[model samples]
Target: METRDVLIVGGGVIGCATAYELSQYKLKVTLVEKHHYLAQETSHANSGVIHTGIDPNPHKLTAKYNILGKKLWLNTYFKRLGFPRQKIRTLIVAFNEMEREQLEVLKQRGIANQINLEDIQMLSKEETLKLEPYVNPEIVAGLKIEGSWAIDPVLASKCLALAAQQNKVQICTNTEVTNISKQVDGTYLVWTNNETTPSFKVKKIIDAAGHYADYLAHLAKADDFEQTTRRGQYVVVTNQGELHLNSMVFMVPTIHGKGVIVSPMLDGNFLVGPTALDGVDKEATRYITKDAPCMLTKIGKHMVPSLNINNALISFAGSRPIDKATNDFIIRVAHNDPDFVILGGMKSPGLTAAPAIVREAVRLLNWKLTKKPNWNGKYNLPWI
Candidate 1:
């Protein structure tokens, strides 16, 4: 008996962002999560950085969204949601001269990606040491990029859901749509496990289901590009008043990915590790092996050699959704269906690129970007 103009699957950051934007419209929006809460999956455990719009290969969707989303988070997100942001600038360090050469490559890539030129600085060893005293003595140079920051992922995701709800969006928790079918009138009938209720109806559905995104697209009869779960782990050292890091310390990144970088959390704990291990099972997002701390310490010491490995508190893991078909993010309407939109392959920088990704989602709905009348932007209140 219930209906809405739009229904969004997945209560992760992407789904929440999409809901927040759509609620700004006159449309009826409903978002559903399989769990009893928001951000229980990959969104709960993350590196927690709204990274500077750098590092992604230029001209890719990752690069475009990362750049745009970084601005959106800094300028607009906070006032609307009202969360404290930890402004941790990036200090991309180089262990050897070859890695130092890579710094120049990233610097150029930063310019090509259109980050503010003045904010990107090349630091000499002497200057780098002054900025990050705890940096390894082996560091010959570093690339400092402004605008990267951190947040409590749990709090941030909740704040996003709160804003969407305040805008008259209905958030349905423990509501997992098992099957989706289109009716002759063009609206979709969504069946769920909540046996107390019948099917929910919606005019359009967004497949922002994170790991299950491709699977949902297939339910709507679209080609499943096949998403692989990449397990990345992060180690946390709590009560870190003993080690106040100036900013996030990094080792030279390679084509593989941004190597284990050390950064400070909002709660003053130091965080490191995210060893990109591929081929992890879908249910193993929280699976942590005994070797997890060892892997983190090995890399964490390389960044801060004198740091005490034994001071570590605990560590956890999360499976990032990696597309088996392409390197860029997958965002499109189903080939044969107009009502389903697929958002998948959200890898590194996806957290930083959330808003831009949602913008693209709205565009796919043929929703015009014209600012809503009387729509209040939190950015207007001077969050910057």
Candidate 2:
């Protein structure tokens, strides 16, 4: 039997960030990932946009954490890791007169969230065209936000994992926890298919399992929330030269999802779509559908008329574990199970909000955390 102070059950950005934050204490932290490499799942396919909380409901926790998390990335941990920083600005383009009216609502929402609206200005057609020459002449008005940017999502996750490892955290890949039961000593017993038998004794277990989080919660006989998978597909432009936009460009918001976005990546590539679809399967991420290209063309033409859909390098999709009930992020210690914490939901902006969520998670685990005398706030060069 082996014992550890804390165990995290996923290797996505959320799990990696959680482990990184937990390792700041003197606790024995172990992270278990089912895949051979980290962030190969949903985190890998993200648009890599570090949202400035411009679109979130003003009162939601997602809005608060996203704003804070963006600030956390401005430090050495991200820059030193060679995570490309395309500090490209953003423009939420309003095509019709109605969308222009909604732009005021969006600006108000941004102000209510306490986000700086100074950089976000409403522009006329001629001004919008001057800033983005490729935009269709028909685009009459828009909202431009100067400080928004994109990052390399994979690098960010890798840096977090590296930081945790440097802090003496143990990461076990290709290990899936099949079953979990309470032991006689009150610690949890965890079973893995890769092992001959169940591993015994852990002080606390965190379910950051992303899509599979609910199943793990059920295995522990604790039911707090149900999750539905919302899949998003994105198209990446192959020829960097074809890229026209200097900023992340977005269409007006919709109830179903944020309408197609034409954004520049940190790698200097242009990307589009990210059409939302709901399902149980994660492998549904494949080619960009016929409808998606048309959708992107409609929005892309407005943002940048020269966007060539045929020059797309590849299209990919990812599933987000959305809460079935309240449709909000779920981050809390299970009501009935004190040793188990749930980090589920986490859909859009989850990547941007991860750091803040991890900070709060560590604070909630106050009793289990102990200050280390040698602990340093600085993370080592992530490449090492």
Candidate 3:
């Protein structure tokens, strides 16, 4: 049987980041993915927004990690990797009198979260028009916050995976771990689909399986929580001339999800709409509905009236592994299993919060980590 010090399941952004961080240690790490390449699942379809921790409930652990994660992306690995940084600021626009009151609450939340509240000041109708000339004139008042950016989610994941591999970590693509059980000796055994397979014995196992994370936890008979899929649809507009939107745009928050927003992509295309819908199947990333475009157009017009929805290039959807009841991130070592860790329920801001999640996972594995004389803090950078 082939053995490794650590085995990570799933090669999504979360899994890739975890592998990259763990490789800094002396442990022999192996990352397994069922897909032919990394990030073929939800990570491939994400909105790609590197959020500024503006909207998360201030009291939640997600908020803490998101803020820390943003700093990590700016100063640590991703910046050194030459990832494309899309300049998309966020504007929380309010249309009516009722929504105007809601803006106050949002501003207060931003202040409490330690986000720059000055960047989220109210914009008058004239000021808003001057900023986004294409916006519908009737729409007035907005909260313009800078520093909200976008990135290529797939590229980001691949870069992390590449860095991990360069650190002598093994990345086994098209290898799906169908079962995992703990041996009496305390090492975890991973079973794969290949008939000629060799079993992997790991001193520690990290389940970063994205949407299927909970299922993997069940395989180890270490279920301590529940996770659900929260799906979101996005539409991309091709060849659409810049409508003067310098940042991501947002409508007032809604109960179901964040209202559709319009933003510029790194490829110079305009992207709109990410309607939240819940589901269990990861393959349910079907086409957007006919009405979705129109609805997005209306909301985009409200935010930036000049946006042209008719120039839509493509539409796609992705799912988030949302934790039930908590509605917050759950990243912790399995209390029931000593050697098995679960990074579960990573939904919105997960892409931005990936690095912080990795740090937390590594911290939880403190007792298992042994420092090597040759341990290096920096990873080999990846090309775009």
Candidate topping TM-score: 1
C-alpha local distance difference test of each model: 0.80, 0.76, 0.77
TM-score of 3: 0.92
User: Which residue pairs in candidate 2 collide?
Assistant: 233-274
Each model's backbone clash number:
0, 1, 9
Candidate 2 residue lDDT tens string, 1-384: 568888898999988988878877888889989999998887887777877677888777778887788777765346544555567777887778888888888888777777775767888888988888777677778888776668777777877788788788898888889889876676888888646677646878888888888888988886657788766677778574644677677877742266358877665677877677776464464334566666655655556777777787877777777888867887788777877888888777888888888787676554845777775545544432
Query: TM-scores of all models?
Result: 0.93, 0.92, 0.92
Model 2: CA > 4 A from native: 75-82, 194-196, 240-243, 282-299, 376-384
Residue 271, candidate 3: Cα error in Å is 0.5
lDDT of 1 by residue, 249-353 (tens): 877667336635888777677788877778887778568888677778788888887677677777788887888877678878877787788878877777889
- Candidates 1 and 2 compared by lDDT, better number: 1
Local error of candidate 2 at residue 246 (angstroms): 1.5
